[PDB]
Design a protein around this nucleic acid. Sequence first.
DNA 1: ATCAAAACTGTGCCGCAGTCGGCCGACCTGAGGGTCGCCGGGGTCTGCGGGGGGACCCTCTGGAAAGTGAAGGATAAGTGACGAGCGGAGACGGGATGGCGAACAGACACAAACACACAAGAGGTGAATGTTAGGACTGTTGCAGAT
DNA 2: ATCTGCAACAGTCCTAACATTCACCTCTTGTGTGTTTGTGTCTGTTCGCCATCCCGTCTCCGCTCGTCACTTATCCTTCACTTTCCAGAGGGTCCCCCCGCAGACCCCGGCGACCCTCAGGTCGGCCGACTGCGGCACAGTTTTGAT
Lengths: 97, 98, 580, 99, 100, 111, 109, 83, 88
Amino acid sequence: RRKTRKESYAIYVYKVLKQVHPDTGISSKAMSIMNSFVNDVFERIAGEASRLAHYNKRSTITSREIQTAVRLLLPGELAKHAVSEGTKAVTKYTSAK
Amino acid sequence: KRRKTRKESYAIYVYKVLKQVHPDTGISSKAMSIMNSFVNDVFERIAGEASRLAHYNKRSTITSREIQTAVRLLLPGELAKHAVSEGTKAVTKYTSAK
Amino acid sequence: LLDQTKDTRITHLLRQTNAFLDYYNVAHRIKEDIKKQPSILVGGTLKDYQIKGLQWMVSLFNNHLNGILADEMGLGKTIQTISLLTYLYEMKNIRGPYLVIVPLSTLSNWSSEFAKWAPTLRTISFKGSPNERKAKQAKIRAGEFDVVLTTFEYIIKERALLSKVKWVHMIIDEGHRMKNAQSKLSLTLNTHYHADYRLILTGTPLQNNLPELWALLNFVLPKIFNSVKSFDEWFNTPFDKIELSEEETLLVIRRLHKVLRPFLLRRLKKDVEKELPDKVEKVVKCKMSALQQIMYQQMLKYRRLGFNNQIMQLKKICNHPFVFEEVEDQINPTRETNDDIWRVAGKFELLDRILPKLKATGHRVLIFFQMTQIMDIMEDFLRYINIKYLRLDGHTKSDERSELLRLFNAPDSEYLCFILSTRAGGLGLNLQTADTVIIFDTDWNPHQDLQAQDRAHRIGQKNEVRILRLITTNSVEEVILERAYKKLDIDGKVIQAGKFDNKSTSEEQEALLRSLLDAEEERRKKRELKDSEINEILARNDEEMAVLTRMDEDRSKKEEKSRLLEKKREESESAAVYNG
Amino acid sequence: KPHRYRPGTVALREIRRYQKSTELLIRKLPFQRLVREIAQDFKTDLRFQSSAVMALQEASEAYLVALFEDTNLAAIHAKRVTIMPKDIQLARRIRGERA
Amino acid sequence: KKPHRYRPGTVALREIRRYQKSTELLIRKLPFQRLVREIAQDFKTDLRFQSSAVMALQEASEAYLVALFEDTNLAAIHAKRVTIMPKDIQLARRIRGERA
Amino acid sequence: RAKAKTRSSRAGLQFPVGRVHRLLRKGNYAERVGAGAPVYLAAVLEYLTAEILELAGNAARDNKKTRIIPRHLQLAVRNDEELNKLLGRVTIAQGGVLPNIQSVLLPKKTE
Amino acid sequence: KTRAKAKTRSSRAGLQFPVGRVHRLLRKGNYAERVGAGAPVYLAAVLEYLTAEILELAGNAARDNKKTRIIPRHLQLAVRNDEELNKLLGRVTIAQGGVLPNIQSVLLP
Amino acid sequence: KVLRDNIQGITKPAIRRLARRGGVKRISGLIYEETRGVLKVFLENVIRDAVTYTEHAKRKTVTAMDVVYALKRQGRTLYGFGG
Amino acid sequence: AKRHRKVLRDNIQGITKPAIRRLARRGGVKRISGLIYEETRGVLKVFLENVIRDAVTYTEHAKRKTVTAMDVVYALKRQGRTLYGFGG
DNA sequence: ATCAAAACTGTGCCGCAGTCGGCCGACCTGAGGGTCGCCGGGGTCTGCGGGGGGACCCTCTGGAAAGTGAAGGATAAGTGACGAGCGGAGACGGGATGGCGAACAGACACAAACACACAAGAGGTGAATGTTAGGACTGTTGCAGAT
DNA sequence: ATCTGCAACAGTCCTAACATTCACCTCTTGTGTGTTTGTGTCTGTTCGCCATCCCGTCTCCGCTCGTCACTTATCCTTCACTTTCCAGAGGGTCCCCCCGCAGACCCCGGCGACCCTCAGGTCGGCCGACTGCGGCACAGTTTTGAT
Ligand SMILES: Nc1ncnc2c1ncn2[C@@H]1O[C@H](COP(=O)(O)OP(=O)(O)O)[C@@H](O)[C@H]1O
């Protein structure tokens, strides 16, 4: 019979790889590593966003909670440029259409 | 007349279980605050573990069995043995006797 | 018209202290007076007003009330207190025990004046070193004591000592620390077990507050809690200029005078001794300078419009900029003192105009400050110019404070100017020889008035005390000045209350209260920078006019860098645009 | 004639009395000045509560106590008694707070 | 002739180089699998094991032991030695917090 | 609409079963909070509070006081071994340590 | 007419990560009661930044080893040689990953 | 062979190869037995948590995600054996 | 001159030498070196930097200026070093 | 300074594993609209933290000196590591029975959310009201050290 | 090795912060009663994978002998931390004088869940066919260790 779908970040990792290095291929084991890495950082950041939600007596995750969760979890230079990418993406999303 | 907004702690319940296990013992206020934070901490650990198991089994309900598995994962050894015993006793008493 | 109602309330609750142990009908219900001074008051005699106050305080003890002496500085408060105590020893025969509480800067003088005016009385001092105090503790638990000097801190630090004794009559001092109701010493005195009677003793009434609540409406008389805890606001609501404050609430002012006739006593220095010649309260006004100019509002426009509670920070730039010293390096990074870098505050151009020319006349000058970093910068300049001065602060540890009076008061002391802090000393300067006071910034209180004016207005000066006061153009320090002064001329009502708080020719609170209302009507009638004008209003006589015009003629053949540095140019607009 | 202890006994009676008592061992006002300094290195306006300063004092004193225990284990293991900076650096590397 | 017996230590250094270049597993798969099935037999009888589960345990426990030998080497350089000893492993598990 | 036993009093417990139910129900730990869930979890919390207060009461008697203080909880928690393993990250305020000195730092018998 | 259903939310912000999939996971993962609107866009941008950084650092490391394919050895070297990524992923072991070439200095004669 | 040599199947040279990966230049003779004891305690903990998840899901196959969830709550995350 | 804050004792030195020595006596340490003091002041500086940075991140998120007990307790809870007593 | 093992390069070519159209299946984001709960907000009462300074009381730190116990280096006997060789043995890549439990597909009940009224448990507050821990006075002796 | 020393450890009022219990005031809020889906439950079918065998193979563990560079224990020197003592000084309280800020309550519009259809992005099994990579050979370079 038809098997139930396994859904993951494989083509999205591969697409970012084809942006930053057009000649390189990725393995299959390394693709699964990047998949588990993305699930891990998603579970961390959304867990911290939910902790900020329950601490500030509020019921809505917003961009401010995702930004505070990023500033807490990611360190240093990565935190700074991650907040940079986030503000760029949200302003381009709201502005253009 | 401002009616200081209620913060509901576990202070009177810690004091009541204390008056069960030691009939003539008092508890200092900062020790009451420590036992309050202890009960909230253990509650948040056990509820969070049941949350993770509700996600992992692809289910959407915290039941007695998910709390039982959260107990067996967090509590070590003899504590886990007696806590599983206490819980099964209390749930069968609650369900059976009305 | 609650006067009869509160007199019925005092008719009810007069006999609290009696049984437990008209407003005249409580304070004049008994008529017994002794005018001749007691026998063992050795070492001189009293004046007449001291005898009259003694008579009133004997009447206070006979009326079994808790009274207040509130007379002026330099009128013998301590000697009236010890005269009360030796009367209560000799004639009243209860002969103890008598707690007194004084500040530590005065207890030496109090124990000294016990030796002159009452040698037969048994007196105990308190000081540091519990190794010393353990023997006095065992002595005072035994019962052999009448007069017990102490200070403020040993009240709470000897809580157990004062608990294990039942007093009869305490008389405490220095009411402007007792002026707070929720103070720790006031709470310990509420839970002290008050024995019978207590007397505040202040040279100063209400200052920078609501009316006389703290003591004279809660603490001293315990009926006045349950009567006027609600009407505090109703009788402070007079303070909306003609109809409220002058037309209808003039009767409210008169009711405050009527309820503050029997409990108090206040005599004036010009009315009996008048050994002080005069006082000349002159003011001038400076202007802004480089960083203090229109450039400064850009600093608020990019910090606030950043340092917390900017009203404390706004006073720094009107005293003197770069107390931060972060922008000092933006002007002078070599930190070498020179002309028109210290002189970039507007008061300082007025300083190096006026101070060399009072040096040309020879007046001994008290220079006051708040904010002792300004005292440090003034120290740095006054060594840059090298003219003689001395410094006093809160760090002098009281030994050099008691010593420094001789260093300043040498008969040929070439120290002429003298740096002070306004808060400092604690009425312990005790100076008389200086003759000119200039003031940089003004306190929130008129205790700056009734202390730092009185540092030369006391006994021993025969010159003409020319007071100057500094202020810039359109600062917040202006609203401190007008706010504090004109909205704390409320003490004018009590200084008018004193002249019928005395022997009371009863036309006072009508006619000479209208003469006070001359000041209350030229309050805002007076609402809406010169070398010769300020040079005249610092001077006294024509041989000072001669030396100022001689300085003028000496610098006439000479020209006199510019007067004040301005916003030089681009450094000011580059100073605080990169900070925040 | 002077009753001087052989060196060590003062250390042992100090160890017993400070393990027996439970107060805070750093003076509150210099600790608060340090905390307000370090907070000024981030956001120049801030304000604390007294319970927050005592929270940081409880946390830092219990952390330094645990660190000095593990430093004493490393310094015993090097056949010494005197703890040294290499003992502190070893505790904070094997524990993994540095690297 | 004389057969070249290496100076003792140089073989240890060339093994350090080749096992920091390479990346395979070092405990053999069938002995480790019999070990895991014993320790699981402690709890439940009729269990089963994916090969992904057994290799997950093998990757995890070899990474744990390589980290432990790195911190053991830090302690046994700290005691002015080279030879590691059982007190070093017990000290590393005592500082890290696994024992006491 | 007769008289209403509380759910704690039905289950034979002391901790508030309804309060643990609403804390689970509003904390977003799952969609559906069961029926046995707050009863079972309140029983577990009653057992842990019973064990801590039992050992802290014994150490409070052993320091000859009749009042349980944070030092007493510190000694009880760090002298039960399974509580040392469970609460091994926790700093208890006003705690102090277990009084325990190494045997190398203790002096010799020869002097 | 049927309006032109196009322009997925990943296309508007210029992201490669699926913003719809991130939003579905934030909803049905029971994190909070009601997920906002800028949230999955912000979060997919953060995850795209992290994956771009790591694949950049591994593609630098596959070039150094003369091999045109990224392997777990390469991901191990990239992560554990970038200091901030080391401190981020310090708890995490990478399968088939090896360790770093780091010999203590006082061991070699 | 007969469940005697289970942990003894963790061989002496395999412990040596782990120690050479750790950087160790020279090894004692009781490192071997202590490392055997350490490995056994760590696997008791991990396989206890994995059997707890497998009992909870009412199944009889300890799988890779059960091992990864056990290691994740242990504190040692495992990338690469399941999302 | 004497007006500077450069001529003033900096603030990490207020963790006094007998205070560090007393912490070590509670820690069990029998004998201390002379460099433990400087190393411990560096270690305390880094630890307070991490905890206060996380507490100020919580505070600036919640749109407030007042670092509180719960903000430091939350920063310690995600630090690892959980603290009891000062809040639920 | 020269011979010797041996590990890194370079070459060949082969097994497999990414990868790329592809083809097609299927399910699940997108949007265009309806609707109500949430949060920002702008305003009063209230209590605590800030920011320049004073006054006063002490224990706690600080500088320095005499001394002595620990750290550390130099040496030297002791021996338990490593290295090489060689004979078996268990691990391993290959390949195939065999059966079993894990993963989908369907009906249907109980179980839980939701809404509704209430009163009874639970939180604040004086307020005595004790009352039990700290704060010292006498007194005893257990552990360390100068002759 | 007895004697002096001295500091921790107990009795005993004493005072006071601080639990502790009424008490009663709200006053929230958990509990009882009633529909309503719908999520789990039992059954029920198959097939992908796991256990179980052999099975040659072959390389790697296990022992054993040699040998030596490391661990460890003395012993000496040197110096650095400890303990005591005298003096001063900053922490600890208090007080000043004003402001500002967080917290705690009220209407009110902004927006995100909510169904409902729609199309096309993702996924998955083959199938093609494509190149990256190893796996057992086969040469030339660069460290190591003795003469
Ligand atoms: N009757 C008097 N005879 C002599 N000297 C007096 C008399 N009354 C007051 N003094 C002087 O006043 C000084 C103290 O006055 P004091 O009680 O402080 O009043 P005030 O507080 O108004 O200055 C003393 O030095 C004393 O010499």
